[PDB]
Amino acid sequence: RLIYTAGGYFRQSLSYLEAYNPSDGTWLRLADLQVPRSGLAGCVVGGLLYAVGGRNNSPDGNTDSSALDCYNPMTNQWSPCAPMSVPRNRIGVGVIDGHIYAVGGSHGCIHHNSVERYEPERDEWHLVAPMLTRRIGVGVAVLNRLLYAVGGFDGTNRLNSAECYYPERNEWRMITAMNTIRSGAGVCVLHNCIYAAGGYDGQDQLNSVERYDVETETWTFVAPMKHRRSALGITVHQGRIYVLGGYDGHTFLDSVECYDPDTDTWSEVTRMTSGRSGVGVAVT
């Protein structure tokens, strides 16, 4: 399985789709997105890569995207799907039982607290219960068939709070807040724990990383990354966390760090073909 990185931003929204093979250390250049996208989120359902939301910030215009596009690795083709009810720039995405949940995001200056769910076998979006907080740049993690939305930006303050969505009950419940305010951080699930890495606390870009244990209801710092990163791509591949690119306050990073939970260590493993931030990343 490969680590796919779709879109991104560097002076403008990008159309790149590249894939990393963690065993051979090789990079693949695949079919470009039809529309350049930054601030999107990626996910995989049924071996198909999906690109949700974001926007195309160009030197000629700026349009937030309600689009859903699905890349087929066997055909190397992007195909458009049913758009969402609203444009969702800086979106969070999670997958439960084959359904793509789209969390928060912004449309111009409107910061969403609404959530919609996509059925791939019917090409249809449907609104579910809205979150208790408006969140853009929110991280999303699926654990125990529950959906966790972590941090983000509510329109006035960057958030350290987090809430949990219960699909069978269609309700949100606030959980323990993190130790650090994080917007545009990398949120993933590794070994029954929710990891949150990097982000932006309103003043600086962070290198700190904390993980949440569902049963202790406590956030715990772990070893920090070698680079400060915000708006980074994150995913899990064979028991290790990979973070890609991001913004460090000066440069757009091309570094790719790898976190091993057994030794609690971050190690640079590769570099992308160019620096970028706000990418959509998924594994298939």
Interface residues with ligand PKG (CB under 6 A) are: 9, 38-39, 90, 137, 153, 158, 183-184, 200, 205, 230-231, 247, 277-278
At a CB cut-off of 8 Å and minimum separation 6, what does 74 contact? none
C-alpha separations of 158 from 69, 86, 109, 151, 163 in Å? 29, 22, 15, 7, 15
Q: Which is nearer to ligand PKG, 73 or 115 (CB)?
A: 115
Q: Which is nearer to ligand PKG, 39 or 42 (CB)?
A: 39
CA Rg, the chain, in Å? 17
Which element (helix H / strand E) includes 55? strand 55-57
CB of 248 to ligand PKG, least distance (A): 9
Q: How many CA atoms lie within 13 A of 23 on its CB side?
A: 3
Q: Could you give phi then psi for residue 13, rounded to 5 degrees?
A: -65, 145
CA-based end-to-end distance of the chain: 5
Q: Which is nearer to ligand PKG, 148 or 247 (CB)?
A: 247
Dihedral sign from CA coordinates of 185, 78, 104, 148: negative
CB of 166 to ligand PKG, least distance (A): 26
Q: Which is nearer to ligand PKG, 58 or 267 (CB)?
A: 58
CB of 282 to ligand PKG, least distance (A): 16
CB of 56 to ligand PKG, least distance (A): 12
Q: In one letter, which amino acid is 157?
A: N
CB of 232 to ligand PKG, least distance (A): 9
Q: Which is nearer to ligand PKG, 56 or 230 (CB)?
A: 230
CB of 278 to ligand PKG, least distance (A): 3
Running DSSP on this structure, what letter comes out for residue 206?
Answer: -
Q: Which is nearer to ligand PKG, 133 or 277 (CB)?
A: 277
